[PDB]
């Protein structure tokens with residue numbers, strides 16, 4: 001019964017086509033699919049104004065998915081813009097941000113569950129000092145990118161958790177839920193960030209499974225930060241945060257990176 005819509009946080013290099021994506025579903029399991037419906041797409045072009053601008057309309061396909069191209073004459077310049085997509089039939093919606101960047105914008109990636117969770121589920125507990133480390137990278141001039149292997153069906157819950165513990169705003173990306181190979185889906189997403197969006201990814205955080213993702217991107221072991229105690233098989237492939245995030249933060253502020 002309850003709507004479970006999501007829209008993808010989109011990051012895009014200036015001058016390039018701007019495409020917004022969304023998926024529209026009802027139910028806990030997304031049991032109902034919203035097929036063939038009109039969805040109106042709004043952008044808050046003046047991000048602090050609270051005023052929505054209608055940009056156009058699309059129709060969901062058989063899987064409830066939506067792809068919306070921003071008309072060239074309405075392309076947004078550099079900045080971060082709220083986006084809201086509204087189902088015309090019931091006035092339900094999804095929200096996300098459109099982030100427009102200059103070429104070569106520098107970013108840092110955090111794998112959510114691997115980087116931030118301390119326990120399993122019941123809201124997982126957050127690792128101590130995690131938020132401050134992410135906040136340190138943002139205040140230092142880096143675009144924050146959050147990736148997770150979870151399906152975007154779970155986006156509402158994941159974002160609520162990030163927001164509850166006060167994580168900095170960033171670009172959040174999930175798996176489509178259908179690939180069955182999340183590690184490669186993440187690697188490919190981050191590659192697309194570097195190749196199509198032209199981001200310069202300077203550091204990667206996660207747990208042991210993420211080393212293969214960051215390695216596939218071309219990150220060096222010194223730029224790869226992995227939570228927990230050193231693991232022998234991974235010895236030269238990454239930096240282990242053996243002492244925790246608080247200690248790691250002091251090391252970053254003495255200019256470790």
Ligand SMILES: [Ca+2]
Pocket residue numbers: 112113117124158161
């Ligand atoms: Ca989580």
